Amino acid sequence: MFGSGNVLPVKIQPPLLRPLAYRVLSRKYGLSIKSDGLSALAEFVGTNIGANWRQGPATIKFLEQFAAVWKQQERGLFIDQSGVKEVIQEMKEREKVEWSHEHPI
């Protein structure tokens, strides 16, 4: 599945994610972000990272992967919370395949 996170999850908010929302995927890749999708993204970045979300490059790489995956499906010009849920489940399947590729088991 995903890489192991050492520290515990925290509930980070859509505030203070504002510079790390529009520049990384909405300008580099052109996808508008709704409020519920931003809240779901903030929740999932919080659960993945913890307290190092401010200085973590894994958040930026995960958002680039999010924009890339939304570019292969092109399910919408916007970003939906249910759409974030489908992309997250497909990413769980995707990195499960990638972990099976890393270690053949």
């Binding site: 504002r18 529009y22 520049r23 909405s26 508008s32 972000i33 709704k34 409020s35 931003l38 916007f78």
Partner: peptide, 11 residues
Amino acid sequence: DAGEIQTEYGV
């Protein structure tokens, strides 16, 4: 009508 969107530093 396209709902509530975000921008760089404001909503």
